[PDB]
């Protein structure tokens, strides 16, 4: 037959690709007074109404680990806490040399020696002139430099850092990612999505959904359900110095307070720079805790085992023990409550082992002030004291777990709380999401010819 | 008669269709591709990105004779040795997403001296014209 | 002046099968996509099913309560709707009306009975 | 889907005073191409139906300079100034905005 | 291959050929991170003005596009025998200069705008 070169523009053909993506904010983030961390005014709100069209007979490959959209997020993350540590107190004069002694009046046997009562010489809104104050420390926080011994800070070898703003807030707000022109975002409408693989029901739509900044460890909270069953995705289930994801599909209610009341005082440090110290606790010193449910826990943790059989054997004991070692951040669950800082000891949460056939649990946790984010060097950050009694009801929704090794493996295995790197913990949100670029130009045969 | 807003197939809506199907929903795609200190710059970055991509693709439509045009034809020869397909096979039982990736390592011939066969169209036109 | 007219309406038993035609005149008729309603005795209009242009894919939208059983075809040539109804059941009582979303038709009544 | 809500459902309405009723939404009507698909139909007895008012507050065909519509989003209202003997039957909002097309519940205008 | 600018010493016999490869030139793709945000800009807005400008006139999307507007403004005094095969274009801007300015406002008000609107007013009928 006679047949001739036709050109058509605006088909539907996409490949792969990698853009920059802007967000969408929510009406009530449009009102606010007291900025938070992750506030407008530096990109745009959205619409009330979401795209979603269904793509029939399309079929789409899916890889979870090797997402551009995860790494854009990081450092979105990254730059909008750096930028809002600017405006208030650098706490430069602090490094001084703090005469600590200890506080016995109320406290009770673990509260022995966590509270300091240090005195220090401090400048004031005139040069000549310098005044004598005090403040309570904790012992995570001051380091001895060689009953009044002398004391320091624990960053005043490494860095002076600025003082957190005593009016931003720390609570996450969801944040929607929306793509550009001439781009698209794919959606897999699967049910049993496990990350990499294809995926049958695909589905475009114009931005994501809110994905809450939640920083924690050991633990997800505050995430997404699963909608059939839990969920255990990992990158290779046989190297075991990758970490495993697993999400749940019933919440597990974790609720946590501080029990002491304490008092935020002011302190005068220069012409309008103020430096907030804790004053005197009224009642007694008790320790910090978080409760889980005894019988809760058990029923979504046989879920966990029995799905965790299907990749390791049908006859292998499956053993939980509780973290290695590291420092601080990696062995203890850490998460932000209200504006203070806990690290929980999650050791009775995991002990327990599987054969193949009106109670809570206490966790003590520890309170710090002085803090490092993100694995960075050199650029910490002091809270300030909150004034009153905190308390806080979280939801946890899956666990970031990790395999010893060793042989035998139809004998038994051995899984770990892990963490580290917060990639992990947006990776569990953007898991069904992908960018793709739109080619709009094409050919193909046509009895069409010119010269009409 | 008036028209109803239910009746659209949305952005990439026919991206499961055969090819003969997805050929009259050309405008939803084409209208898509020009639509709107740090992080300030690289927002501008993209946008310039992106003007300055779709006009390569219009000023190769300038060259051709497919000027303001989505569905145009010319008189470039089809040889066998591309795509041995009848035209009951590709505009009724392939997608365009399929076609694109069988017709992909012989587009470059197409894209170049077989179809910039206007200079035999402009330079046998104007001497047409200097004829009276 | 546009002219709708249905026809081929009657009584069927329950799982019989039934073929409605609507007619159009005055207009081009391919040119206008096609929808169609009923009207259940002693309620409101409900949509039924729909059929677009042969320029725009030509494809279908049905109503959850009718998919399936139901399906509508369009023929260029004589200008005639053709709607199919195959296993209905005795809710399926109405009168089926042919539209082009501007002008109406008389319609016919469909009642099914043992 | 979307559902409609017509409120009254019965108007008595007396031959020569002013009549106004009322339609709602659960969701917005607008759509992707900044238009928002709202019908008016008139459904007189032993008669074919009638569109009064598409596209929320534009006249169609016919309507002799009486029916009249207004509205934003999500609450609609149609006016009628001068009623006649003729204007006797139900009424019905339908949206267009996304399938499936959800008709509205009633409105029996009666002589009394 | 003569590549980009090639023809420049050559003849406008042999100029005249190879118009393709200087018109894909044109449209290619903080120190150096507002450096090139400022210099892309003003080329895409280099190359939109010029299409514009072509385009008022009759000629939309041909490379050489010749028209009916008589050799008068432009007073070049010279025949076609010794233009187009002893003389180049980059002398032939010497001579025509002062009257490019005379000579693109025959193109749009004797050109295009007056020939568009019998046109307009023949399709009626
Ligand atoms: C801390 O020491 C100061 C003396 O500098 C004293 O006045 C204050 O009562 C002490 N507070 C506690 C809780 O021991
Ligand atoms: C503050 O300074 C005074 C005298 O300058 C000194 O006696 C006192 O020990 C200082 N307090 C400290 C170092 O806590
Ligand atoms: C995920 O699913 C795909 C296909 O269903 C399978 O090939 C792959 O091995 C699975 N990966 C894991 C970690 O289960
Ligand atoms: C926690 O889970 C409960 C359901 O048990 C839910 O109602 C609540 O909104 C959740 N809290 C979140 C997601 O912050
Ligand atoms: C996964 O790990 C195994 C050993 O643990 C290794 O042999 C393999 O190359 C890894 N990668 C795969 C299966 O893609
Ligand atoms: C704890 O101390 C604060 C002082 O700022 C006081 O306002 C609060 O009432 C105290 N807590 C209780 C339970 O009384
Ligand atoms: C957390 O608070 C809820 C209601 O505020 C309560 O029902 C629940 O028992 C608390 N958590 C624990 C572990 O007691
Ligand atoms: C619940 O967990 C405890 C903790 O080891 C265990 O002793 C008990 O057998 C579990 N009960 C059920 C019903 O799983
Ligand atoms: C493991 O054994 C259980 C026994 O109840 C069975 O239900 C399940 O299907 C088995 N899983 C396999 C064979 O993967
Ligand atoms: C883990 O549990 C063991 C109990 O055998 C304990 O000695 C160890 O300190 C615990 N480590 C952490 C990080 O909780
Ligand atoms: C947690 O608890 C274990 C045993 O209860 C104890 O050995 C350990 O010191 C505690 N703290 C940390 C940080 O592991
Ligand atoms: C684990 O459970 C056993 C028995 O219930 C208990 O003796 C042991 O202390 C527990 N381990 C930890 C780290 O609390
Ligand atoms: C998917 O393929 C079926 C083939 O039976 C076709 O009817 C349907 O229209 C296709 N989907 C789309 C969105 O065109
Ligand atoms: C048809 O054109 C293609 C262009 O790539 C060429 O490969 C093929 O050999 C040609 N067939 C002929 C000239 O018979
Ligand atoms: C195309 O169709 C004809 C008959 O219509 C048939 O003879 C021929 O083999 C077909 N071409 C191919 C490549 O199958
Ligand atoms: C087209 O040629 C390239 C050459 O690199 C090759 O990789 C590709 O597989 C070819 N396409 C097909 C469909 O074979
Ligand atoms: C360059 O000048 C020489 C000397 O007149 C001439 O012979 C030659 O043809 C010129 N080059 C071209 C490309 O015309
Ligand atoms: C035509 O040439 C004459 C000669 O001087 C000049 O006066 C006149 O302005 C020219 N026409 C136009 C339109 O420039
Ligand atoms: C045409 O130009 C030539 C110069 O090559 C000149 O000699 C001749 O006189 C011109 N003819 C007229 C009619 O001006
Ligand atoms: C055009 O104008 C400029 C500026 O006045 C002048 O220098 C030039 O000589 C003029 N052109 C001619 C051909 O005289």
């Known amino acids: 037959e006679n047949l001739w070169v036709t050109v058509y523009y605006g088909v539907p053909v996409w490949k792969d690709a990698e853009t920059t993506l802007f967000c969408a904010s929510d009406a009530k983030a449009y009102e606010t007074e007291k900025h938070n961390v992750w506030a407008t005014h530096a990109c745009v709100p959205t619409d009330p109404n979401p795209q979603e069209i269904h793509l029939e007979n399309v079929t789409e490959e899916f890889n979870m680990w090797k997402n551009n959209m995860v790494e854009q997020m990081h450092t979105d993350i990254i730059s909008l806490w750096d930028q809002s540590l600017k405006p208030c107190v650098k706490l430069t004069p602090l490094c001084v040399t703090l005469q600590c002694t200890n506080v016995t009046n109320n406290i009770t046997d673990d509260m022995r020696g966590e509270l300091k009562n240090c005195s220090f010489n401090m400048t004031t809104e005139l040069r000549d002139k310098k005044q004598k104050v005090y403040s309570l420390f904790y012992r995570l926080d001051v380091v001895q430099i060689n009953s009044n011994k002398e004391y320091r800070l624990i960053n005043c070898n490494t860095s002076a850092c600025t003082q957190a703003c005593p009016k931003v807030s720390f609570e996450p707000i969801p944040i929607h990612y929306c793509a550009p022109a001439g781009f698209a975002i794919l959606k897999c409408k699967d049910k049993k999505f496990n990350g990499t693989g294809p995926c049958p029901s695909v589905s475009t739509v114009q931005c994501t959904h809110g994905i809450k900044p939640v920083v924690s460890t050991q633990l997800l909270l505050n995430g997404s359900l699963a909608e059939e069953e839990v969920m255990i995705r990992s990158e290779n289930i046989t190297n075991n110095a990758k970490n495993i994801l697993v999400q749940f599909n019933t919440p597990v209610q974790i609720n946590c307070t501080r029990p002491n009341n304490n008092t935020r005082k002011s302190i005068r440090i220069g012409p309008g720079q103020a430096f907030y110290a804790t004053g005197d606790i009224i009642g007694d010193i008790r320790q910090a805790h978080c409760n889980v449910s005894k019988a809760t826990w058990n029923e979504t943790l046989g879920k966990v085992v029995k799905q965790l059989r299907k990749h390791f054997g049908n006859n292998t004991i499956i053993r939980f023990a509780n973290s290695s070692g590291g420092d601080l951040e990696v062995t203890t669950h850490s998460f932000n409550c209200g504006g203070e800082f806990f690290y929980c000891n999650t050791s009775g949460l995991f002990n327990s082992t599987w054969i193949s056939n009106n109670d809570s649990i206490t966790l003590p946790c520890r309170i710090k002030q002085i803090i490092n984010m993100w694995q960075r060097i050199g650029q910490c950050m002091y809270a300030p004291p909150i004034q009153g009694v905190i308390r806080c009801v979280s939801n946890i929704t899956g666990l970031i777990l990790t395999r010893d090794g060793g042989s035998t493996n139809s004998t038994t295995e051995t899984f770990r709380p892990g963490g580290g790197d917060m990639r992990d913990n947006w990776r569990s949100e953007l898991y069904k999401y992908k960018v793709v670029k739109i080619e709009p130009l094409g050919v193909a045969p046509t009895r069409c010819k010119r010269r009409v | 008669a008036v028209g109803i807003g239910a009746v659209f197939l949305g952005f990439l809506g026919a991206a499961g269709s055969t090819m003969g199907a997805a050929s009259m929903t050309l405008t939803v795609q084409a209208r898509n591709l020009l639509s709107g200190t740090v992080w300030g710059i690289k927002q501008l970055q993209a946008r310039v990105l992106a003007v300055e991509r779709y006009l390569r693709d219009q000023q190769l439509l300038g060259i051709w004779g497919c000027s303001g045009k989505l569905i145009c034809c010319t008189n470039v020869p089809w040889n066998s040795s591309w795509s041995n397909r009848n035209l009951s096979e590709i505009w009724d039982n392939m997608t365009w997403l399929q076609w694109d990736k069988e017709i992909s390592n012989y587009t470059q011939i197409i894209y170049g001296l077989l179809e910039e066969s206007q200079n035999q169209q402009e330079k046998n036109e104007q001497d047409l014209l200097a004829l009276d | 002046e546009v002219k709708l007219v249905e026809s081929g309406g009657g009584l069927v038993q329950p799982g019989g099968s039934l073929r409605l035609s609507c007619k159009a005149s005055?207009?081009?008729?391919?040119?206008?996509?096609i929808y169609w309603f009923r009207r259940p005795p002693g309620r409101g209009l409900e949509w039924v099913g729909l059929?677009?242009?042969?320029?725009?894919?030509?494809?279908?939208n049905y109503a959850a309560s009718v998919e399936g059983r139901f399906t509508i075809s369009r023929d260029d040539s004589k200008s005639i709707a053709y709607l199919h109804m195959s296993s209905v059941k005795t809710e399926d009582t109405a009168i089926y009306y042919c539209?082009?979303?501007?002008?109406w038709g008389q319609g016919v009544l469909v009642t099914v009975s043992s | 889907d979307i559902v409609m809500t017509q409120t009254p459902i019965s108007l008595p309405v007396t031959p020569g005073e002013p009549a106004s009723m009322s339609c709602r939404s659960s969701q917005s009507l607008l759509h992707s191409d900044g238009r928002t698909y709202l019908f008016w139909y008139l459904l007189r007895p032993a008669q074919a139906p009638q569109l009064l008012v598409h596209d929320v507050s534009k006249r169609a065909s016919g309507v002799p300079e009486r029916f009249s519509g207004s509205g934003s989003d999500t609450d609609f209202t149609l006016k009628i100034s001068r009623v006649e003997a003729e204007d006797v039957g139900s009424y019905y909002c339908m949206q267009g905005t996304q399938l499936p097309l959800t008709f509205g519940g009633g409105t029996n205008v009666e002589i009394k | 291959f003569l590549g980009f600018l090639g023809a420049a010493g050559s003849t406008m016999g042999a100029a005249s050929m190879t118009l393709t490869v200087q018109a894909r030139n044109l449209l290619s793709g903080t120190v150096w991170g507002i450096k090139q945000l400022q210099a892309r800009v003003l080329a895409v807005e280099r190359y939109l003005r010029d299409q514009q400008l072509l385009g008022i006139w009759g000629c939309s999307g041909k490379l050489i596009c010749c028209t009916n507007v008589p050799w008068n403004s432009s007073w070049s005094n010279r025949n076609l025998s010794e233009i187009w095969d002893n003389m180049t274009w980059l002398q032939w801007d010497k001579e025509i200069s002062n009257y490019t300015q005379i000579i693109y406002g025959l193109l749009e008000e004797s050109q295009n705008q007056q020939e568009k609107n019998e046109q307009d007013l023949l399709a009626l009928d």
């Open positions: 059929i677009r242009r042969n320029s725009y894919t030509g494809t279908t």
């Open positions: 005055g207009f081009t008729f391919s040119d206008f996509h």
């Open positions: 539209s082009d979303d501007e002008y």
